[PDB]
Each structure stands twice: as C-alpha cells, then as structure tokens.
C-alpha cells in the first residue's frame, strides 16, 4: 500500500477538490467508475499545460475552473432548452404541479375518502380543469371583484385567441384553402 | 555545425510520467487520504505492534472503493440510493490522524 501520487500531486488535487466539489465527486459519486474519463484528471492535465505555457499556479487553477464552469453552463443551458421543449408538450411535470399532486395526496390522507367520494372529487376536478372559469367574482354579502382564478384549458384557448374570442386574428401571409 | 538541418525536425520524447499519473485510476478517491501507520515489529518478545497505542492492525474505516456498493447492492438495484447521502459522503471516510 504505497500511493503513486507525489506530495505535489496530492496537494494540487486536494486544492482543486476543495475549491470545487463538483469536479471531485463527478468522477466517483457512489462508487469509482474506472472505465470512464475523470474530470479531475482532465483539470490536472489542463493545469499542467497552462503551467508549461507560462501561467502560474493560482491563475492556472482559476482559468481551468472557469473552463469547467463554462462547460457546465453549456450543459445546463442545453438542459433548460430541453426542459422548456418538454414541458410545452404538457406531459412533463415540474414543482408547480408536484406540489398540486402532493396536496391531492394530503387531502386523500388527512380526511379519509370513500371510493364514491374520490370518484366525485375526480369528476369535479376534471370539470374544473376542462371548463374552469376565469376572473371569479366574490360578493360582499353588492360589491364584486373579478380575481382569484385557476388555470384551465379553456383559459389556454382564450389566451391563445389573444383575449378576443375570435380565432381569426393573425393576418400575416397565411395560406388559404379554396 | 551539422545539427542545423537536424534541429528543423525537432522531434522529441513525449511525456510519459504525466500520462501515467493522469490516466484513469481504478482506485481513485475524490479526496486523497493519507494512509494510516502500519504496525511494526517492535522486538523479539514484544512482537508486531503499532507505535501509537500498540495496535495489531492498521486503523481504517473503508479500504476499498466499492464496499459500500457491495453492501447496498440490493438498494442500488432497487434504486433507493439515487440521492442518498450516507453512502455518497462516507464511502471513503477514514479515521482522524490522531498522533503527536
């Protein structure tokens, strides 16, 4: 049991891992995957290249870390683009609807619902989803305020219609059919 | 004199120690840990003891990079350890260097 790493290499990799926990844990995670490339190894290689190019220790470390962060930013930008594209389809869920699902589960748990009760809940929730109203009115009893409306597919349709109610609003060079 | 034309090619030996030290290692830990003192042969009548407190073995918590996965193989297959923390952070934990 004699490590092949020189003390200089040990200090360098320890400093890199202390500055960034992403580079250290990315290669290993739960168990060392020995057949894949290691980001820490790539960072050390780039640091050595900068050192022989003429950049000293701190500036080389900062530059290589900034390059790694630029790569991670590219990855996250791609992830965000794909996330928007997928969530536009409507079959993908984020936290804003995961909280709704958790609330439904909490409602089912805290008050016990019979099969008839849960079926009625499902039917009424489907009705409110399909034909949900907009600008709900609350009476003073007199005085009514049009606010506090939840999302619905008919609301999506009316906002696609530019809040006009007429599906004919775009007049920019649209092809015709006889 | 004659090396003027030879130096134009300027083919030189490529690094190898750097390549060996930077290629992927089967046993690599995210944080390097200093190995603990191994027991030594104190004498004929004493035997083999460590210098710190007369231990018979080397102080360690985890020696291999995969014992946590071996222990939690069933959980790993079931996917319970997708975001676990105890295995993720304490896989390579080692005892504190307690000596003067």
């Amino acid at each position: 049991d004699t490590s092949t790493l020189s003390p200089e290499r040990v200090a360098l990799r320890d400093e890199l891992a202390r500055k960034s926990r992403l580079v250290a844990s990315e290669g290993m995670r739960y168990y060392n995957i020995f057949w894949v490339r290691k980001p820490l190894d790539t960072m050390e290689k780039e640091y050595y290249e900068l050192k022989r190019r003429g950049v000293d220790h701190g500036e080389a470390i900062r530059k290589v870390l900034q390059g790694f962060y630029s790569g991670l930013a590219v990855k996250k930008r791609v992830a965000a683009i794909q996330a928007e594209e997928a969530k536009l389809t409507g079959r993908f869920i984020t936290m804003r609807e995961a909280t709704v699902v958790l609330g439904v589960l909490a409602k089912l748990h805290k008050e016990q619902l019979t099969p008839h009760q849960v079926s009625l809940l499902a039917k009424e929730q489907g009705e409110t989803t399909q034909s949900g109203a907009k600008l709900t009115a609350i009476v003073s009893r007199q005085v009514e305020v049009k606010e506090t409306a939840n999302d619905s597919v008919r609301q999506l349709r009316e906002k696609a219609e530019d809040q006009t109610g007429f599906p004919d609003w775009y007049t920019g060079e649209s092809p015709t059919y006889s | 004199i004659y090396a003027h034309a030879l130096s134009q090619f300027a083919v030189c030996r490529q690094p190898w120690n750097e390549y060996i030290g930077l290629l992927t290692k089967q046993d690599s830990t995210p944080y390097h840990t200093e190995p603990q003192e191994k027991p030594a042969y104190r004498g004929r009548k004493q035997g083999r003891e460590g210098w710190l407190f007369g231990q018979q073995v080397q102080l360690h918590y985890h020696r291999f990079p995969d014992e946590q996965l071996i222990t939690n193989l069933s959980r790993w297959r079931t996917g319970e350890t997708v975001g676990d923390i105890a295995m993720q952070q304490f896989r390579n934990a080692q005892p504190f260097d307690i000596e003067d």
Binding site: S6, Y48 | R13, W16, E18, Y19
Partner: peptide, 29 residues
C-alpha cells in the same frame, strides 16, 4: 544502515530538474 532489503530504498544521494532536460520532460525530481 549498511544492510538493504529487496523492496527498500537505498541511501539517497546528497546533491546540495536542471540536469534532466535530456530525459523525460515530465519526470519530476
């Protein structure tokens, strides 16, 4: 010590790298 094992380092030479340019450039001290 004047007796050396098979897997033990010998006495290091005292110098008191500069002279390893002709050898592998990445070879440390």
């Amino acid at each position: 010590r004047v007796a050396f094992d098979f897997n033990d380092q010998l006495h290091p030479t005292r110098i008191g790298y500069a002279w390893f340019a002709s050898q592998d450039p990445t070879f440390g001290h």
